[PDB]
Amino acid sequence: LSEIAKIMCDGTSLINQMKVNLLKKNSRQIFAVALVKHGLFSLDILETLFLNRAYITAYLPDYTLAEITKLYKNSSDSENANMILCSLRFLITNFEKDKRHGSKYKNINWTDDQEQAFQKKLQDNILGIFQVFS
Numbered sequence: 001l002s003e004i005a006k007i008m009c010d011g012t013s014l015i016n017q018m019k020v021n022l023l024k025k026n027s028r029q030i031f032a033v034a035l036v037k038h039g040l041f042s043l044d045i046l047e048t049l050f051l052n053r054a055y056i057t058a059y060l061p062d063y064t065l066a067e068i069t070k071l072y073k074n075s076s077d078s079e080n081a082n083m084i085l086c087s088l089r090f091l092i093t094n095f096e097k098d099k100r101h102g103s104k105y106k107n108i109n110w111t112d113d114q115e116q117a118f119q120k121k122l123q124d125n126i127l128g129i130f131q132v133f134s
Contacts, residue, residue, distance in 0.1 A: 020053045028058050029066035037073055037084050043102045068129040
């Protein structure tokens with residue numbers, strides 16, 4: 001209810017309505033990203049993450065401003081801070097996304113197939129992210 005505690009002071013009764021929009025209005029990605037960096041990459045939990053308010057329009061945009069902020073956490077004991085994000089680098093498309101490979105991405109291991117595949121995919125959005133950076 002911290003959000004409910006935050007939304008309450010955020011304005012009276014109509015706040016419950018603005019609670020749903022303002023939830024993802026800022027970050028549906030950084031929210032995911034920090035969470036994806038926090039513990040779990042599971043899309044089902046990601047659904048259950050935003051299912052606590054009010055469909056896939058949240059997970060649709062999850063593919064671009066999104067990918068950027070996830071790369072802004074890179075900072076031995078912090079060696080996995082890269083790994084946790086490094087695993088978030090492998091995972092991508094709807095085929096690979098919609099399935100339990102989302103929980104298998106963190107199993108990295110990394111296929112030699114993708115090694116040339118996502119390099120094409122990151123280079124697709126490599127320019128867009130800097131358009132957000134710059």
